[model samples]
Target: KFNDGNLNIAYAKPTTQSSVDYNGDPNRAVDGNRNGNFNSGSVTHTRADNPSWWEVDLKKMDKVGLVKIYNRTDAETQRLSNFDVILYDNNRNEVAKKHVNNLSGESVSLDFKEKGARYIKVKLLTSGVPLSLAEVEVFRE
Candidate 1:
């Protein structure tokens, strides 16, 4: 339910099973958040189901502050916070990897204090729940 306000900044990709970019790849991601306002209900994968993949680009480099992420909790798609929110620069180098657990409701939050980068890759290490990134606000402070 975040990112429903900010307009200048937005997520990169939003896809589904049949329309997914990394459709049948090992890097498939779930569209857990609404970039421009496309709600992905519950597309999470389990030990025995189809895993979806979604990606996004920061568009440009900015001093990122925090990333607010959400997940669709249901019978099929469980909440998964045990993964890497990897951050990279233009050269595709590992900048930051934030590991977190689902404690703050279905929407979990991880902050980047000093580490700043241009590009970011939220690799859903585990397929437990369909993540919904409601909002991603990068503050200069």
Candidate 2:
């Protein structure tokens, strides 16, 4: 089953976002690929907006431990700065939240300490910066 051990529960899950830009789609982040290059077709992108966001629905409330956000590698890495990784409960209450001011490497790994969530979102705080991700992964322990 897909519910065993520490696995990527967000893999190939349902996703949505504020808006689209070019050929970047929300599902790309969950495609189980970490290509880093947007042209490689494994990145999710959203148009520049005040609260540009990308969300993944886990379908049901599950214990979430670690989250990994893979930022674009080749270019526009600055656009992924100053964002929040949020987790929501089944009833839509905020379960946990973490802020990412900048990306020092290719990805940002966050440990929410095994919180329960139905939906997880990565949102850019600043306006006029498009949101893009090479991949988004969730794991439980």
Candidate 3:
């Protein structure tokens, strides 16, 4: 187990939920973020012009390590600046929260120690350049 009190932990999984395109053009959308239709930016040239999102259902709750957010593609005119993480309890109540801005790397990890969540929401705070998220993962300890 990790430093925290947890059983076997699952790293960010690549379930059918992970493969996506951000825009939702049958020809382009991959497992994009929940901001909009599930599409891939690489396949959808229109992505660099708009905003989109995709998500996953944890199916259960557990202490998580860092969430690795993948930006599949970025609008040529804009750079990924900020992204937000909102955790919802089984009842849809917000349990934990974190927002990442000033993207320095291809991925960002947010540590969550206060357990109790069934749904994890990753929202794009400011995606000016059409952002294509390749993946959003939850790492557990």
Candidate 4:
């Protein structure tokens, strides 16, 4: 299966977010490190706010095949209970939207079916809950 020829398109890609907390820069999610523990200094943490979000810009339109999101591990995984993974075109049109009802494990993966998009965003749905993530990986054919 490793020979399927999928490439990780999000590695070191530029990222932005709604807010920052605990010095958890948005870039942490795309660093190719899935540490999951906030204390380890690589998790992305956003302030307690409604609709907190983390976004990655691909720098150009590319075909997205899959996306993996690693949740914060140290007992706050439930904070990711509700969220949405959205894809946007280069001109800012929404291409896809997937709502995550809850998180049951350390990570979650979503299939995009090779849609062309330039921006991807993971946004929390609850009010005043901080958004945290260990990593976000996007793959292309």
Greater-TM-score candidate between 2 and 3? 2
The per-prediction CA RMSD against the true structure, in angstroms, equals 6.2, 2.2, 7.3, 2.3
Q: Candidate 3 lDDT, tens digit per residue, 1-97? A: 2213433232232222222333333222223332222232333222433343344456676666566555444333234356567777767788888
Which digits, one per residue and each the tens of the lDDT, describe model 4 over residues 24-118?
99999888788998999879989987779999999999999889888999858898978999999999899999999987789889999999999
Kindly state the number of residue pairs that clash in model 4. 0
Q: How accurate is candidate 3 locally (lDDT)?
A: 0.48
TM-score of each: 0.56, 0.94, 0.57, 0.94
* Candidate 1, RMSD to the unseen true structure: 6.2
Looking at model 2, residue 125 earns an lDDT score of: 89
Q: Better model by lDDT, 1 or 3?
A: 3
Q: Candidate 3: misplaced stretches above 4 Å?
A: 1-52, 73-79, 127-131
Decreasing TM-score order of the candidates: 2, 4, 3, 1
lDDT of each: 0.44, 0.88, 0.48, 0.88
What are the per-residue Cα lDDT tens digits for candidate 1 across 33-104?
A: 422222333232223223323344555556666665544343323334555666767676878887764445
TM-score-best of 3 and 4? 4
Show the colliding residue pairs in model 4.
Answer: none
Judged by whole-model lDDT over C-alpha atoms, candidate 1 comes out at 0.44
- What lDDT tens digits, residue by residue, belong to model 2 across residues 1-141? 132355799998899998999789999999988898998888888888788999999999999888988899989898888889999998888988999999889988999898989999998889888999988989986
> If the candidates were sorted by their lDDT against the true structure, best first, what order would they fall in?
2, 4, 3, 1
